[PDB]
Amino acid sequence: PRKIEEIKDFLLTARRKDAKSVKIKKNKDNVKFKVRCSRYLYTLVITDKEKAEKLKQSLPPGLAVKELK
Amino acid sequence: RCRKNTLARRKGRHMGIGKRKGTANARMPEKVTWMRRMRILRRLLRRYRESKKIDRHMYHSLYLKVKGNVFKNKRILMEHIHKLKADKARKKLLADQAEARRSKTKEARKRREERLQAKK
Amino acid sequence: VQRLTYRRRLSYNTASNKTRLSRTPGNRIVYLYTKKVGKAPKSACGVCPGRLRGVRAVRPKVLMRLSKTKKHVSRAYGGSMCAKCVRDRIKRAFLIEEQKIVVKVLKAQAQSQK
Amino acid sequence: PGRGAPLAKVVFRDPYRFKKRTELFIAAEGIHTGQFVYCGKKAQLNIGNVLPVGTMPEGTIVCCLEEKPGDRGKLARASGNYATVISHNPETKKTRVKLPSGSKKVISSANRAVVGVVAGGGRIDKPILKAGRAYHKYKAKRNCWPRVR
């Protein structure tokens, strides 16, 4: 598993061809975006809710998004 | 029940001549006691030497004395240090007073000689 | 306490059958089977007892996966001989060649004299 | 194991191809690591060198003597043993040698020999104090120790 600390590189990873799905974890104090590529699971961790939601809309349209609880 | 008895034993009960099976060495090893005391005394000497209460030569001398087992506790060693410091300070003060008097005599003689030469 | 068992069909405390204890996310204690501790390369000089520096100490067949920079150092005889003996070898070669030149020129001088 | 004398591992360079050859000698006493040992007919005479017995002067002390030319050393190769070059004979090229058993032998004067005594001397002067020491001494050699009358 890998942790991505930047946002636009995570966006590139999401637009990668091997990306099968993105799953959104909403826990207290945190929001995590997990992209499932061929080899690694990439996690982007951000602590701001409106940044999280704008990123959620900014995610690519053709990739299966799934929020989980 | 067990920890009631342990509280009693920490106050010191149930630990007399009758209730002891192993040797004194078996219960508390003398090597462990010696090693503890060595660590305590080495640490005190190092703290004193780094805080400048004593100098390197005195430190080395009573370090070897500690290894040679002339001090039994921490306090005995620090009192010996106090006595050594007092004696060293007094001897130094006497030496400085004497050498100041000697230097006065020497430079007064030199000044008298140079004014004699100025006369001649 | 919880006292536990092996996980393989080898039940002897041999060199390959070494384990460590780990607490799992299921709140249980298990054996994991550790890897044998590797060694850094020894210097080719044959004199220095110490190991080389800058080289990963791993079991030898693991060195295939490593990159080259994690296996050697940037110097002549990098990762195969220590710096001290490298510099003594350089100095020895140079001074020996100088002495050889000196003896050759003295031989030529003696031949001229005779 | 099983031998009193230590062995000296020595590296020569092959004169016919680009290689280095490693060999084991019966270490003459006084040798040390980093030393240069010289092999051949006209190497000078000092401890550790090997040269034919027909060239060395009489009275020379020798170890690892070669009983026939080409045999690569057979005689006087136990810890502390040596042989003595007694006399020469140029015609018929033969040399008299005194062996560590007190015997005298006639040897072809063109077989090599190491200069010096074999290292590890004085080993039999220490008493084995116990059957355990004797047992371990003979365990590294062979199964013959606990002898029965």
Binding site: - | - | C48 | G4, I47, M56, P57, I61, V115, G120, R123, L129
Partner: protein
């Protein structure tokens, strides 16, 4: 303090093997466990690794020598005689 009168290193053998054997092994024991000065560096770091093999802890230099002593009188006299023989041979 001094803990024994006669027996030194052979105090570890107790009352065994005989007084004469213990006496004649004492000096060899001392000789083989002594530290000798290295002729190559000047430090006293010469240990007997195995029988006949002496090692310097600082030089990392290894010498072939006696079984219990660093060198033997036979070795030294042979060395001197060989030096004299070479001197005579080259005149």
């Amino acid at each position: 303090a001094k803990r024994t009168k006669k027996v030194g290193i052979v105090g570890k053998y107790g009352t065994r093997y005989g007084a004469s054997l213990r006496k004649m092994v004492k000096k060899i024991e001392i000789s083989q466990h002594a530290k000798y000065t290295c002729s190559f560096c000047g430090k006293t770091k010469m240990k007997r690794r195995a029988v006949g093999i002496w090692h310097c802890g600082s030089c990392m230099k290894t010498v072939a020598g006696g079984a219990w002593t660093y060198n033997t009188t036979s070795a030294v006299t042979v060395k001197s005689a060989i030096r004299r023989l070479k001197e005579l041979k080259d005149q």
